[PDB]
C-alpha cells in the first residue's frame, strides 16, 4: 500500500539520469563560437578560421566530459563503500546470529532474510522485544547462617513477602536453593545484603 519507501535506489537512478541528461544537453552551447553545430561551421566558411571555431568547441566539450568523469568516479566510490557494508551485513546477520547491538534490527537479533531489488538488497530482520513490565524489590546477596549467597545466573526478587530467583529477561520465580546459588565469605562486607533462608 504505502509507496516512497525505497528512496535510496530512486535517488541513485535519478542522479545517474540527471548526470546523463546534463551531459547530453551540454552539446547545444556556442562556447563563444559562431554556431553550436559543426556542420554549419564546416560548410559556411574557409578553414583557416574553421580551426579556431572548432578549437573553441573542442575545449568546451572536453571540459564538460572531464567534469562528468570526475563526478562518476566520486559516485562510484560511494556506491562501492555501500556495497561493502551490505556484503558485511549479509555475511554476519544471515549466515549467523549477531551479538553486536543494533547492527541489524532494533532489539535482540534472531535471524534475517534477504530479498533482491533492481539495484540492491533488502533485509528482513526478526527481533525479540520484551514488554509488560512490573516492579519488584531486589537485593544483591542473601545472608544465611553467617554466609553470603549469590545467584549463579539471574537475580533475587521479592513480591512483598517471599524471595525468588529469576532469569533477567523473563519473569519466572523459583525457590532459592543451594543448587542455583553459590557461597563466598560472610555477610559483613556486602552493602545491602538481606536476611532470608
Ligand X SMILES: *[C@@H]1O[C@H](CO)[C@@H](O[C@@H]2O[C@H](CO)[C@@H](O)[C@H](O)[C@H]2NC(C)=O)[C@H](O)[C@H]1NC(C)=O
**Distance between CA atoms of 133 and 123, rounded to whole angstroms?**
30
21 binds, among ligand X, other proteins, none (CB under 5 to 8 A by kind): none
**Distance between CA atoms of 120 and 144, rounded to whole angstroms?**
62
Cell of 97: 546470529
By CB under 8 A, the residues from 8 to 37 that bind other proteins are: 8-9, 12, 16, 20, 22-27, 29-32
Return the number of the residue (110 or 162) whose C-beta is nearest other proteins.
Answer: 110
- Phi first, then psi, for residue 35 (nearest 5°) are -160, 165
118 binds, among ligand X, other proteins, none (CB under 5 to 8 A by kind): other proteins
Return the number of the residue (30 or 159) whose C-beta is nearest ligand X.
Answer: 159
Residue selected from 8, 106, 147, 162 as contacting ligand X according to rule CB under 6 A? 162
Cell of 45: 566558411
48 binds, among ligand X, other proteins, none (CB under 5 to 8 A by kind): none
Residue with cell 572548432: 54
Which residues, including other chains, have CB under 8 Å from residue 94's CB and lie 6 or more apart? 111, 112, 113, 114, 123
Return the number of the residue (102 or 133) whose C-beta is nearest ligand X.
Answer: 133
78 binds, among other proteins, ligand X, none (CB under 5 to 8 A by kind): other proteins
Binding-site string for ligand X from residue 107 to residue 146, where x marks contact by CB under 6 A and - marks none = --------------------------x-x-----------
Cell of 17: 539520469
**Distance between CA atoms of 176 and 156, rounded to whole angstroms?**
9
Amino acid at each position: 500500500s504505502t509507496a516512497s519507501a525505497l528512496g535510496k535506489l530512486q535517488n541513485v537512478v535519478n542522479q545517474n539520469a540527471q548526470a546523463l541528461n546534463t551531459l547530453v544537453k551540454q552539446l547545444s552551447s556556442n562556447f563563444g563560437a559562431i554556431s553550436s553545430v559543426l556542420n554549419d561551421i564546416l560548410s559556411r566558411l574557409d578553414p583557416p578560421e574553421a580551426e579556431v571555431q572548432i578549437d573553441r568547441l573542442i575545449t568546451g566539450r572536453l571540459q564538460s566530459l572531464q567534469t562528468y568523469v570526475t563526478q562518476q568516479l566520486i559516485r562510484a566510490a560511494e556506491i562501492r563503500a555501500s556495497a561493502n557494508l551490505a556484503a558485511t551485513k549479509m555475511s554476519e546477520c544471515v549466515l549467523g546470529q549477531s551479538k553486536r547491538v543494533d547492527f541489524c534490527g532494533k532489539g535482540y537479533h534472531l535471524m534475517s532474510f534477504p530479498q533482491s531489488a533492481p539495484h540492491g538488497v533488502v533485509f528482513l530482520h526478526v527481533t525479540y522485544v520484551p514488554a509488560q513490565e512490573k516492579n519488584f524489590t531486589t537485593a544483591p546477596a542473601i545472608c544465611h547462617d553467617g554466609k553470603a549467597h549469590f545467584p549463579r545466573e539471574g537475580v533475587f526478587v521479592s513480591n512483598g513477602t517471599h524471595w525468588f530467583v529469576t532469569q533477567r529477561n523473563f519473569y519466572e520465580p523459583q525457590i532459592i536453593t543451594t543448587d542455583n546459588t553459590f557461597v563466598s565469605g560472610n555477610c559483613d562486607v556486602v552493602i545491602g545484603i538481606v536476611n532470608n533462608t
